[PDB]
Amino acid sequence: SDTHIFIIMGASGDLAKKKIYPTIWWLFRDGLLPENTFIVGYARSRLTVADIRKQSEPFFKATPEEKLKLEDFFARNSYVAGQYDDAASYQRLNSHMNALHLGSQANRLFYLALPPTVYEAVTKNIHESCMSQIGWNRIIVEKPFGRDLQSSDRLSNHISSLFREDQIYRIDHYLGKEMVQNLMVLRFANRIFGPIWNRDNIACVILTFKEPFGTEGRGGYFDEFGIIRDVMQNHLLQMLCLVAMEKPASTNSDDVRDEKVKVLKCISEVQANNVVLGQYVGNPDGEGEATKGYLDDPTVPRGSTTATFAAVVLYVENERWDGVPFILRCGKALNERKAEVRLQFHDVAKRNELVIRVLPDAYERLILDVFCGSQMHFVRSDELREAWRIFTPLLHQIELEKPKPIPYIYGSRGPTEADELMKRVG
Amino acid sequence: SDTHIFIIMGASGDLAKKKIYPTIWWLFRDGLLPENTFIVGYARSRLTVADIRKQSEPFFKATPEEKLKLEDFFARNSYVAGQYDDAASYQRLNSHMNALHLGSQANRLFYLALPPTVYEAVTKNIHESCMSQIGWNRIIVEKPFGRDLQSSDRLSNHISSLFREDQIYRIDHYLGKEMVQNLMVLRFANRIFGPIWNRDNIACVILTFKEPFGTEGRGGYFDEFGIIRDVMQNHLLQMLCLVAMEKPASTNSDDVRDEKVKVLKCISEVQANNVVLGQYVGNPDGEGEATKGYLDDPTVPRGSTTATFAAVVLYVENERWDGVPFILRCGKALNERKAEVRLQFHDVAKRNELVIRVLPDAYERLILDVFCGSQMHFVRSDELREAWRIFTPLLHQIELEKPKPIPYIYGSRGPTEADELMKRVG
Ligand SMILES: NC(=O)c1ccc[n+]([C@@H]2O[C@H](COP(=O)([O-])OP(=O)(O)OC[C@H]3O[C@@H](n4cnc5c(N)ncnc54)[C@H](OP(=O)(O)O)[C@@H]3O)[C@@H](O)[C@H]2O)c1
Ligand SMILES: NC(=O)c1ccc[n+]([C@@H]2O[C@H](COP(=O)([O-])OP(=O)(O)OC[C@H]3O[C@@H](n4cnc5c(N)ncnc54)[C@H](OP(=O)(O)O)[C@@H]3O)[C@@H](O)[C@H]2O)c1
Known part of the structure; x- marks a missing residue:
């Protein structure tokens, strides 16, 4: 449909504040994001949307005459705080996502801005708590894809067990703008x-x-x-x-x-x-x-x-x-x-x-x-x-x-x- | 065979002194010319080999320790003087070419360093006087190949009348070293x-x-x-x-x-x-x-x-x-x-x-x-x-x-x- 949620799992992190928060701003700012898009941060560290802005807006290159779009962007932003293996937290996420306008029907894009030592956990919870019933679900998994075959296999199998290959977006994006x-x-x-x-x-x-x-x-x-x-x-x-x-x-x-x-x-x-x-x-x-x-x-x-x-x-x-x-x-x-x-x-x-x-x-x-x-x-x-x-x-x-x-x-x-x-x- | 004559028809000229005399020096100098090669200049202007050297060696880039090859080069050089439509002259050329070592048998390369207003004449005489009986004969014709179709045709027909297409080397060489x-x-x-x-x-x-x-x-x-x-x-x-x-x-x-x-x-x-x-x-x-x-x-x-x-x-x-x-x-x-x-x-x-x-x-x-x-x-x-x-x-x-x-x-x-x-x- 016309309604999208961008869950940044690990919003406190670096990739969080330094790349994705900004990069999404630049797609909002130039209206390349679907019109009815919301952004939800999810980490443990008990912080406010305002809190994200203060440490992250630096990397935005906010120019004092686009700052009315920008206000509208942080209006779309929220953040819920919770553990990565605590079904009670993933519960307080998923039910807050239903609250948002047309959240029930909404498409769900999960960005795992998290060191893969926690992927097995986060993936399992997202499966059984958070996946949209109507909307498509897509997980963005980040490098490293493990270090050897044995390791990449064991993890890749865990994820391809919960998610169809057409839900698994493995993103390599580190060797520059071109x-x-x-x-x-x-x-x-x-x-x-x-x-x-x-x-x-x-x-x-x-x-x-x-x-x-x-x-x-x-x-x-x-x-x-x-x-x-x-x-x-x-x-x-x-x-x-x-x-x-x-x-x-x-x-x-x-x-x-x-x-x-x-x-x-x-x-x-x-x-x-x-x-x-x-x-x-x-x-x-x-x-x-x-x-x-x-x-x-x-x-x-x-x-x-x-x-x-x-x-x-x-x-x-x-x-x-x-x-x-x-x-x-x-x-x-x-x-x-x-x-x-x-x-x-x-x-x-x-x-x-x-x-x-x-x-x-x-x-x-x-x-x-x-x-x-x-x-x-x-x-x-x-x-x-x-x-x-x-x-x-x-x-x-x-x-x-x-x-x-x-x-x-x-x-x-x-x-x-x-x-x-x-x-x-x- | 192993014996070659390079006739520079119009040796007084510019292409003469400024390009070919030199360019041949550079192929002699680096022994890319067949070993038993001679160079014969033929124009009207009554001058000596020495005379050619004085105005031409400038463009040679003669370095005071290759000047024993160079001496040997001008030893291979000669010049006979004559009109371009005077069978008596083309006669005094052809008979001087027979004088040279193995001239009788020798291969003959004719460079028409002459404005093509005189090509019809020079070509006709070379045909009936100067062509080697045993050796191959090759004419190098220079630009312009006429200015229109009618003109290029009338001239090209004159030459392809006396000479097989496998004797007609049309040389374009003016748009640089590469x-x-x-x-x-x-x-x-x-x-x-x-x-x-x-x-x-x-x-x-x-x-x-x-x-x-x-x-x-x-x-x-x-x-x-x-x-x-x-x-x-x-x-x-x-x-x-x-x-x-x-x-x-x-x-x-x-x-x-x-x-x-x-x-x-x-x-x-x-x-x-x-x-x-x-x-x-x-x-x-x-x-x-x-x-x-x-x-x-x-x-x-x-x-x-x-x-x-x-x-x-x-x-x-x-x-x-x-x-x-x-x-x-x-x-x-x-x-x-x-x-x-x-x-x-x-x-x-x-x-x-x-x-x-x-x-x-x-x-x-x-x-x-x-x-x-x-x-x-x-x-x-x-x-x-x-x-x-x-x-x-x-x-x-x-x-x-x-x-x-x-x-x-x-x-x-x-x-x-x-x-x-x-x-x-x-
Ligand atoms: N070329 C590359 O390989 C490259 C470059 C950059 C990053 N990355 C990848 O990007 C992802 C994100 O890393 P990042 O640079 O954003 O920073 P990060 O600080 O390592 O991770 C961001 C957040 O993850 C949580 N976290 C960190 N270590 C944890 C642990 N041991 N246990 C549980 N939670 C932990 C924290 O959230 P809370 O304290 O708020 O709960 C932290 O703020 C990783 O998969 C990393 O491998 C790849
Ligand atoms: N890109 C180009 O188009 C280009 C560039 C350079 C030259 N060329 C061609 O190169 C050839 C040679 O020209 P060049 O530059 O060496 O100089 P040139 O002075 O025009 O010709 C050399 C010699 O030709 C004789 N000659 C000149 N005009 C004559 C005339 N009207 N009647 C009879 N004989 C005449 C003279 O020999 P004597 O006084 O010793 O008898 C003169 O020293 C020509 O075919 C020219 O078109 C082409």
Whole structure:
């Protein structure tokens, strides 16, 4: 119908005040939100709507002549306080949601702005207390999708037990404002160059995510995570799919995501001698955050073997590709800020290659994609499992054998051995 | 065999001293010339080899430690003096060429560094006096290939009467050091994207030759010629062919040139309402040659209606293309120095487009291409005729009706109406 509730589970939190409260303001402010939308915060910390505004409006960029819309926005806002495993609380939520205008019939969008240590609990209660009887129910689950296959599996199974895959919006939104455009053009590209993109013409596909800036004083988070999990397993691996996938049956969210998965099921398990891990050390003869290395960051615990740059060769194995090496190369603290897919062709009779680089605005597009109900740019349960199947074995070997990453100087291309790997293949 | 003669017909001239004498030095100097090569100058002006050196070595970039090769080069040089229609002179040439070591058997390369007002004469004499009996004979003919169809036809017929098309090397070499690379990648590109490049995917191909610099004090030459003849009829029209051509039967000089011609025969005659001619006026608020316009050049005769920039729509008409408008856009004194072919695609469910931009070194590659005997990057008699057939009617209408070109400010993109034309089509 025409009435929507946006439940921000964990409204006290950072993602809460710093991204979603604002990002929703910017969709209200420019009337992209369904007209009869309400916002309900739900955490333990006993606070008022006014209280949220005071710490959050800073990040809004409220200009003294839009402040009559804004007043109307906080009029739509409420907050109920309660535990995440206390049916009495989820009760005091669900019954307050019925109070709101047409709440009975209303659509329900649940944003789990909560560390997934509490997902099993929150999901179970939302199921049996809070789900709309008439309205659709959609849960936005946040990274990490677990750390290995075993863990992502155990959790993903808990959620796909309570919720249909068409209610599970897994949101990755951390690699910057253009992050969805990346995925669009690489699909618009599979369409065009489909008949060309074969082992026949192509020798070596390379997908590249460079960032120039460091970990910047938050290395301590990046640490318990690492560059393979932060960029490759999720994003790079996804666009690799968009390149190698077949003609989707249609343009349906599920027909494409099907095709992506089909690619993934035909990649076997990345092995160590196809991988060059690299950690950044600070710059002698530079200035800014570039004098500081990874280990100079005081939130990184002493002597971290954590990869801050990786180069990895995957083979898709079927008729269409095969021998064809996909190279995923990505790093924090490098030379440029580049996101590009290069396809090198067999220069039969200087090698020849094709390159692909990069008003609603990535995160914003994802909040609307979920309200609309297109699951396109979100990862599917089965897509994720396959993704983990691949990297887990390597990842497990690294946690265990704790191999020292190849030092590389801040603002470098990466380690030298990374390029020597690209060549040892094609 | 292993013995070659390079006859520079018109050795006194500019192209003589400023380009070919040097360019051959640079192929001798880096031993790319067949080992037993001789150089013979032939003009009227009674001068010595020494005499050539004095005015020409300046342009050589002779470095005081390669000057033992160089001595050996001028040892290979000679010069015989004679008229261009005096069988007694062509006699004193041909008999002096027999004198040279193995001249009897020798291969003969004739460079017509002569204004084509004398081509009919020189060609006829060379035929009946000078052609090697054993060795191959190749004539390098220089621009202009005439000015209209009637004229290019009358001359081209005179030459294709004395010489097999596999002896007629028509050399265009004036649009800069990378000019052959342009044509290479656009063919390497027809190969790759062949199956894609259809009316199905593509809406609007645009081929673009911008130069930032003026006519620079030599407008007076450009004038009796004009931007359609200087850049479009010849170069742009050629790469249009390389884009739209079919799979050549093989990679033979003649199989490809065949395919190019096939494209051209399927373009009908450019008409005036598909054309935006533009002349540059100098820059008020700039400096250098940019204060000066076209007409401020003192070699341009007062009130010239001469096009210094053109935008033209051609339609290739067959199954493969059709409706598909090729737009050729080119200008002297513009914003950048760009040579690029853009292919815009039908963005089914911001318009999407493919772009193509840009040790032996263009002119150098052409001198060797002719010694080797690959006629690839040279225009064919029949290719040229078709080229002229197209532009002549328009061109004739402009000489006759003398239409004032749209003024455009130096360092501009071109005239505004040029873009309004691109849109009135696609
Ligand atoms: N790239 C990334 O991986 C990335 C970036 C940012 C965040 N995230 C994800 O975003 C989600 C939200 O994190 P956040 O940054 O907003 O901050 P957070 O402070 O970790 O979580 C926000 C709220 O969660 C509650 N909370 C925190 N720790 C808890 C615990 N151990 N037990 C129970 N409740 C707890 C608190 O609510 P109350 O005190 O009010 O009850 C807190 O204000 C997480 O899933 C996180 O993994 C992902
Ligand atoms: N983009 C272009 O269109 C371009 C650029 C440069 C030149 N070209 C072409 O290059 C060729 C050579 O021209 P150039 O620049 O070297 O200079 P040029 O001086 O016009 O010709 C060189 C020599 O030709 C002879 N000559 C000149 N005018 C003559 C006439 N009316 N009758 C008889 N002989 C004559 C003279 O030789 P002697 O006094 O020693 O007998 C002169 O030294 C021409 O075909 C020209 O069209 C093309």
